Amino acid sequence: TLKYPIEHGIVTNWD
Amino acid sequence: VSPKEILNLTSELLQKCSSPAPGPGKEWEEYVQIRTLVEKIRKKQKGLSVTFDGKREDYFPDLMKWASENGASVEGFEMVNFKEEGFGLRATRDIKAEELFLWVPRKLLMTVESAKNSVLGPLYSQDRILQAMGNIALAFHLLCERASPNSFWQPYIQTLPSEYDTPLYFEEDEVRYLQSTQAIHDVFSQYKNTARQYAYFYKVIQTHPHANKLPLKDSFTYEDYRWAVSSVMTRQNQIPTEDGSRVTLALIPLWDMCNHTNGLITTGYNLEDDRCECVALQDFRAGEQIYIFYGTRSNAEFVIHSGFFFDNNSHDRVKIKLGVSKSDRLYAMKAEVLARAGIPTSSVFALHFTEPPISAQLLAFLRVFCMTEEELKEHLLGDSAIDRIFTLGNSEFPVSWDNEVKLWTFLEDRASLLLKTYKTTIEEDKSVLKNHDLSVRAKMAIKLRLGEKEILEKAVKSAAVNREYYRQQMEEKAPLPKY
Ligand SMILES: Nc1ncnc2c1ncn2[C@@H]1O[C@H](CSCC[C@H](N)C(=O)O)[C@@H](O)[C@H]1O
Secondary structure (H helix, E strand, O other), rough: OOOOOOOOOOOOOOO | OOOHHHHHHHHHHHHHHHHOOOHHHHHHHHHHHHHHHHHHHHHHOOOOOOOOOOHHHHHHHHHHHHHOOOOOOOOOEEEEEOOOEEEEEEEOEEEEOOEEEEEEEHHHHHHHHHOOOOOOOHHHHHHHHHHHHHHHHHHHHHHHOOOOOOOOOOOHHHOOOOOOHHHHHHHHHHHHHOOOOHHHHHHHHHHHHHHHHHHHHHHHHHHHHHHHHOHHOOOOOHHHHHHHHHHHHOEEEEOOOOOOOOOOEEEOOOOOEEEEEEOOOEEEEOOOEEEEEOOOOEOOOOOEEEOOHHHOOOOOHHHHOOOOOOOOOOOOOEEEEEOOOOOOHHHHHHHHHHHHHHHHHHHHEEEEOOOOOOOOHHHHHHHHHOOOOOHHHHHHOOOOOOHHOOOOHHHHHHOOHHHHHHHHHHHHHHHHHHHHHOOOOOHHHHHHHHHHOOHHHHHHHHHHHHHHHHHHHHHHHHHHHHHHHHHHHHOOOOOOOOO
């Protein structure tokens, strides 16, 4: 399957 | 418009946004206080430091040519300004599902490592916030290249939007719709963090010698930072490094022009060719918009981080904080059972709109939360103890009929309590959306607060149904299913 699936606009920590 | 006045405002802004939380009961006043300071700085500045003469569509041809020269796919689609989603890709030919129709080599991407090798490199290797937060590093990477006329990524930067629908762009009264909701605290945090970050880095740029070669040294407005962090949070991607050992954040040109629809993730990374690849999520006839599936994010995350509300979001959810009370005489046993199950004593769980309402981890917590002492002992002692813990997250194998009735009674009461902490009701929210003419940003806020209550309302009914199912099995003395 997709060896590195790419979640578009993945939520990251800004704190 | 002296720079010394702006320095005094950013210093006041940094200290205001570095103060501790004033308590959740004064967060709205603090938010308005920070808004007032930000808007006064923004009114004294000239907006985006770099603007382009042509309109956005004028630069798409250069994006296609630039992407074609570096090995990306440029045939089979065109850029169209759609009303619902803004600019996007439209198929100029029939595209069958699972067809590899879009690929972007790594050379086109803007990444944290490309930021390390850019003019931002020297400052990156000294500032801890840049090293620890790749998303902020990408945001300044995007700003420095935007202000550099001969940047390799100019064709991509000149096609980016000039404004977004993240809460950072909302009017005060549009955010006020979110009062007494779960989402508004994240809106507060986003705004306070962005304001603190801008003032912090405004002073860092002015004091660090290894930031003198930056274009930001001459102009770095709040509008610049809001646009940059909004560009990153609405479009960033996690890709593997060149060797494949570590993951990094990236902006993926051309492919990030696709808008979101429901489905499955069809975008991956091919290390053998070192390029992002995307297969068609569904059949796309010529003249139809090309969509992708961004991910299983809630409408709250789509609004706050992606800048839109997605109707009929199959993965929508709300948060619910639960924990074992230290006043409980069975706290020690419950904490040990949770620890052996890999579940903390206190945590933030999720209530989903699609069945089932609770995850396996939340079901396991609620079971232990409502266990009697004798049930806890059977999960801690004996040759079958670990086997009992192994099934705690499985709905097919309850601890006992009484344990189920108690956990679903609790969830129904708690979900009913959460509904009573909102300023408006579901029927009132629907009346506002129907009888008032609202902006897109206002509709997002009202739909967001409506969605929270509708998920809680569905959890109430689903918990009441489960309560009656397991009470039937208990009144009829049903044999407990064993694994
Ligand atoms: N299903 C959807 N409904 C509405 N807007 C959407 C959407 N999917 C994506 N968007 C918009 O597209 C952004 C992600 S980038 C996708 C291309 C974008 N429309 C552009 O003009 O550059 C989101 O922040 C949001 O503004």
